[PDB]
Symmetry: D2
Subunit: 387 residues, 4 copies
């Protein structure tokens, strides 16, 4: 069977299995969950670690006394379980004060508070052993055109992240930042909507090396984009610092279904890529057990997240191992793709008559790509109607 073990690197945020089910049109259908219990319940399931928003661990506005009380209880569950905290993030979207964003709110004082709120939780994150600190600017954006001048908003966003990089370097912390993009929801349009926009923005920072991305399956799909393709570009750039796994059934509200659900073929191609690419980071699940479920459903859902990954991992390995497939790849010229286009140089290429002058486009066009047989073999493997 497919049993998960901490070696599998499966992590969950406290806000996932702890989602009470409140949605824009309804009230919670599940009671609150104590962080400590989530950690032990997740450990029992085979999880490798957990993640958290500051507000998930410590109630907003809690006093220094209560705060410390909340971390101790949390620390005790981790210690007794050996559960890791590989990632932490800040909540800059729930409280009304962040209604127009945190780092890019028009009000300067909210921006300052947002930075101070973030820095406090970074200290905590490092203390617990977190290697990656995630930022999701869910409230950074607008619903109308003049409410936000994006050029200047980007200036403020850069200022915030540059300030965070200075802090982290001045303290000598060994932690990196990962920007998690999202096209929209809760704002009409969110700034840095996709993996590409985030990657591009990162290269305009004072210390680009400290920042990367934490893409989420469902978010890129909310833009109708190809997640695995997006992930490939992030890997090609050396910026996949983390990743959120879940399911989305197309362009609509952020569903946050359990991994495997939604676009199944995309999930297969994602796993194929992550494993074949050698990604060594956590396989984090940012999902939400549907509000139709009780606590038995919450864990059954959480378990489903890892099982599907393990099953998909097996099918992908089988797929690539298959000699029939390797032959199918050669037939489609996947090997010629890896060959430099002009390893001989520009000049040589310019004097190469068989590259233009003596080239027969019609003859080359007649070559079938043989992509379909290859895809059907991929399908056979996924359905297990073969390895």
């Amino acid at each position: 069977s497919y049993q998960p073990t901490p070696e599998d690197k499966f992590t969950f945020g406290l806000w996932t299995v702890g989602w009470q089910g409140r949605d824009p049109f309804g009230d919670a259908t599940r009671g609150a969950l104590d962080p400590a219990e989530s950690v032990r319940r997740l450990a029992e399931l085979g999880a490798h670690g957990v993640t958290f928003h500051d507000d998930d661990l410590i109630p907003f506005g809690a006093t220094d006394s209560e705060r410390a009380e909340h971390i101790k209880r949390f620390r005790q569950a981790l210690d007794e379980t050996g559960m890791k905290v590989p990632m932490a993030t800040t909540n800059l979207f729930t409280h009304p004060v962040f209604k127009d964003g945190g780092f890019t709110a028009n009000d300067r004082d909210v921006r300052r508070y947002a930075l101070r709120k973030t820095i406090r939780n970074i200290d905590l994150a490092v203390e617990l052993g977190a290697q990656t600190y995630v930022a999701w600017g869910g409230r950074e954006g607008a619903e109308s055109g003049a409410a936000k001048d994006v050029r200047v908003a980007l200036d403020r966003m850069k200022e915030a992240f540059d300030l965070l990089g200075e802090y982290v370097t001045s303290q000598g912390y060994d932690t990196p930042f990962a920007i998690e993009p999202k096209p929209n929801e809760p704002r009409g349009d969110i700034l840095l909507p996709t993996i590409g926009h985030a990657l591009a923005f990162i290269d305009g920072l004072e210390r680009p090396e400290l920042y990367g991305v934490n893409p989420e399956v469902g978010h890129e799909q909310m833009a109708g984009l190809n997640f695995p393709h997006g992930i490939a570009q992030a890997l090609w750039a050396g910026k996949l610092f983390h990743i959120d796994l879940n399911g989305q059934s197309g362009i609509k509200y952020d569903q946050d279904l359990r991994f495997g659900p939604g676009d199944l073929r995309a999930a297969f191609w994602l796993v194929d890529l992550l494993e074949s690419a050698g990604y060594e980071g956590p396989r984090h699940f940012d999902f939400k057990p549907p509000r139709t479920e009780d606590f038995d459903g919450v864990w059954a859902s959480a378990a489903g997240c890892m099982r599907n990954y393990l099953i998909l991992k097996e099918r992908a390995a089988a797929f690539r191992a298959d000699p029939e497939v390797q032959e199918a790849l050669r037939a489609a010229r996947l090997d010629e793709l890896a060959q430099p286009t002009a390893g001989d140089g520009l000049q040589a290429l310019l004097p190469d008559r068989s590259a233009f002058e003596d080239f027969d486009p019609d003859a080359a066009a007649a070559r079938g790509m043989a992509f379909e047989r290859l895809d059907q073999l991929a399908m056979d493997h996924l359905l297990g109607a073969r390895g």
Copy 2:
């Protein structure tokens, strides 16, 4: 009234007003147009210049004798009209040989031919005075997962553009490249699908300064993204080298409607941004007169493209000039957005008690953003129910 003059910088590609109306489910509904005639007809309309794909000017496979004959006729119409050729591009998507792409085709020989085909047209482009050379990788992508290894495909894409940069520098040409992104169509998923992905890829090139982007209104909207926001990020990065204007009515096939049509409010915010940002490049129209039209409709459509821009330009200027609006902006704190978040520095910010310790989130949250009044004023101006 709103009359266009060459000073307005309105340009058109030969393939726009020259589209015969062939679509995936139908045959042409208009006869071929001679480039020379388009140039004169466009000049009469007030256009500033024209653009072209190599295959638009010279028939594919044409001999050196016929080729020269085609350019001469074209050159004669330009000379007599004083029409400029500010941009040129290559056609690497129509011929069957490019069925799997040009720069990223699995077949190495097609990739070489693609580069040679491009370099030839660059020479021509410079000869005609083109300052920007556009690249739209319409065939670079895939319909199935294993048909293309995106990491290596990106390597090939980088190789191609780096080779193009070497060539352009070795010849001392004063011309820049602009990548035109598109999410999908004709391929299931196209590489560098949005402005963000293109911007990010550019910073991985050997000579980033030579490359920028040529975004198209309808393309970003095919991903459901906010075009003006995307344009702002391109401007913030100093990469808006060119721009294609048109209309799209949502997420579906590439419509290429005339500018103004489709998302009208977005067109207003785009114009507002371009003018207020001081963009000084061509206002290029990559549209397609619907195939329901005759030649009278083709020019009426082309004329509509510029009129709408002129009308939108007027409304935007009026909008920003309006003192009632300037007051509305201050009320929404658009001015505080331009104020550095921590001009006093990190240390000072860390010791600022009124930024966290003595901050009252509830009191600040109570402040209305007053975004709606601002938006309704924007609406009033657009409909001319005011300036």
Copy 3:
């Protein structure tokens, strides 16, 4: 100027201007509003009437004593204002018990309770003078395939509505039902997702005459459909019993922006159609003032809803009145469209040689539709760069 008066038929639901701003990722940013105050504030704005969910007027679980107390206060504000209550609806989506729907919940007892909850509020609705009772099955649907057998779910949906029709007829009430479709959110997929599905389902009811539809601008657009086209089919069928006006910026979560915002051209074509079609029902606004606003923004937003309609109404009238347009319509053959295709009959048509045998397709194909000039005139009128 454009001032609204009760004669304009502008109505608002209590849940609109009364939305506290709680969203899936945040807490309310506005305090509760007393129904009585909304009625007086809306009356002052020029509204014609208001609508309500049972739970909007009476707190869920309220005792018969408190209930009566809540209706009296509400009744007093109406009486003193002369405000009408043309429509009422039930809330079968907020309480956890409706997590799997009301009429189509798998649990039979929840279905019964849902019917009883609805019937109670129908009595109240009639008592206040409501002519239309709206049903929005926001929770009727699923997130996974086997969780719901749609054929049987439809059987249960039909049973519920048939039961409602029997009740309404047995009591002799003069009230009709309007089904409000929505593609998704809060459920992964909602049953009767569009105007078409609702219309089709209605004809399978025992008493079709009693049911029609209450389409919402943003909902059909969440499916990427053409609202005005959808509205036309509902009118053609004689089923547009009501209508919800608002704005949506494309395929994403239900934004519920103020009318005019979102797809502006669609709003123009909608108004053109409603007025030219002679729709005589309320112009109901089911929108949500953005949570970035305070109470000043809430009313400014509400006011914007009516102003935009009045401005659009003017532009449409001007557009159709314009003789230049009437000439443009004839040029596009909008008049031939109204001519029966075969008023002479089938037999005659079969013996008509000029309909096939002697028909010249090429000659007819050469005729331009002249749709662009017509559209640009429509644009000129909308921007007021003309009547």
Copy 4:
């Protein structure tokens, strides 16, 4: 293994395996295919029959002499193969004359020609044994608002179909019509965009019994809708007369991928429904082998269409047969869903205290739907990590 046999009812249109690969941005990549050869090649593959557009079998404008010559050759291949022709349709979208549609073109003479063109092919269809005649109004719609008055267009559409019903009845033919909906492409918006709109329109015809729908997987998904849900409503109405199977990877241009590709989970739920519902019509494949393929790819793709259906059929049967699943269904109350809500009647329900008065919503709300375990079992079966 999964071998197809004529008993499987797999049919293909000549235009599918015969697509030359011409797309909006490219030229054909495959040569023409002779109908006769397709029939024999498909028969060899295990197909049950074929379908055709009039223009697919007989070249447009062909003389009565050539026409007869084309049908004879076609008839010979069928006879020798024993291949059936269960469905036929008309091509009213390719020729320029249909640029504004057929049945709803503004020009009355084009509408007449469209009807005459259709009637001719109906005669042929019946002669070959076709039981269903499909209509896809690909050109019926618009790109701009005033170019088409949808109310009157619907009148013309109704007139056309009513005329077709009169003809078919006057001749005593035993053939039914199936409307194939599509949201957009090639027109900006197509009339009767979804299954629902088509179903609703059908009930406004003079002889509703003669008409049903021929939904296509990819088309409903172009609107982001749930195909299986749509199919369920068509079945519930007794209108699923035919069905087109294929794949689509989300909201974008009509891909027409091979069945199984695109939304795989949806394909599983579709097959589950068709088989469990007892649909007895052809499993028609309206797909397009990608233009990257040669003829070897064309048949490999065609074969993939049936294999995937056979594999999915097996997995669905296994899924429902599984006792663990049957137990999971009961746990989710799928059985209570089949129980009448008020089998006891309205009056009894009104006097039932345990349906409202004595009902405990909170207690009922606490019941988990147990939908996730059920879905994960569905997943296990699909991946074959179980039956």
